[PDB]
Amino acid sequence: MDVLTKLLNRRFLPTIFKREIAHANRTGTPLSVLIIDVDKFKEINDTWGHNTGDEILRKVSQAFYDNVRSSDYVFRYGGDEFIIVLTEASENETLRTAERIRSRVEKTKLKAANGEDIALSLSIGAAMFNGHPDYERLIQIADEALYIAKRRGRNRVELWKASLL
């Protein structure tokens, strides 16, 4: 019942992605990715301990599951990072999902071991699958979108957009 054990291990990412890209290419349905970063997680983790960090990760993971469908995939990608794969969600539906997740985490109230308010936020990079055969390319451009979100000040969603150049 620990929500964290629900998370998929990244070792399954390529297989799942290659399968969903294959499917998206034949049916022409949308496919998209959220790469999610818990803001200042490393800072919080050694300022309040590893037990606090785990609770953040539980609150954050619960937010993901409350906003996606059984057809979607939720990965633990790194220490502070997650990847959500959405299937058959339009660009707008994808952005709305990301925002529901982002707002939900921002509004979440959490206290440390000693009762102090720990402010929580997420940075999110979103990108739509555009037919490119490599799943690594879809993850790369979402990662570019996420780098933009962090550099713009965190607690936000960015959608990867092709340069008008």
Side-chain angles (χ1 to χ4, degrees):
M1 192 54 79
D2 182 22
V3 67
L4 289 177
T5 62
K6 293 290 184 179
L7 299 175
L8 297 176
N9 186 272
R10 62 193 309 275
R11 69 187 181 89
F12 292 113
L13 251 182
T15 302
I16 278 169
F17 251 122
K18 289 174 186 193
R19 187 179 59 198
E20 292 296 346
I21 281 176
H23 177 265
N25 268 336
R26 293 291 82 240
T27 71
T29 51
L31 176 66
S32 61
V33 182
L34 309 177
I35 300 190
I36 303 176
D37 215 285
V38 182
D39 295 329
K40 302 170 177 298
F41 186 66
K42 291 180 185 176
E43 169 189 318
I44 297 172
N45 217 23
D46 53 359
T47 307
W48 305 113
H50 290 189
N51 296 337
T52 288
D54 287 9
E55 190 183 355
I56 293 176
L57 291 184
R58 284 186 190 96
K59 296 290 199 56
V60 153
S61 288
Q62 193 57 55
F64 300 160
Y65 288 113
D66 287 1
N67 282 282
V68 303
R69 288 196 188 178
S70 73
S71 62
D72 307 324
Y73 305 83
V74 187
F75 295 90
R76 179 77 177 286
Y77 188 61
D80 61 335
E81 258 195 18
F82 303 87
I83 287 183
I84 301 184
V85 182
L86 303 173
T87 68
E88 302 182 291
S90 75
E91 169 174 312
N92 281 115
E93 292 153 8
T94 295
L95 281 181
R96 274 190 285 264
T97 304
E99 178 59 31
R100 278 194 274 254
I101 292 171
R102 186 207 57 81
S103 186
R104 162 90 171 254
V105 174
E106 184 193 329
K107 292 183 182 309
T108 298
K109 296 310 171 191
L110 180 72
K111 316 299 175 62
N114 73 345
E116 189 177 354
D117 287 19
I118 302 179
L120 293 194
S121 66
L122 303 180
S123 291
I124 300 181
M128 305 302 302
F129 168 74
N130 56 31
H132 195 286
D134 284 321
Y135 80 90
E136 296 90 338
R137 183 60 190 167
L138 177 45
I139 293 186
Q140 175 188 341
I141 59 171
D143 196 35
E144 295 178 4
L146 172 69
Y147 182 70
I148 296 175
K150 294 176 181 175
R151 289 294 295 158
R152 290 191 62 177
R154 303 183 176 267
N155 191 6
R156 64 201 303 128
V157 185
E158 293 279 330
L159 176 79
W160 187 85
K161 296 181 186 294
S163 171
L164 304 179
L165 289 155

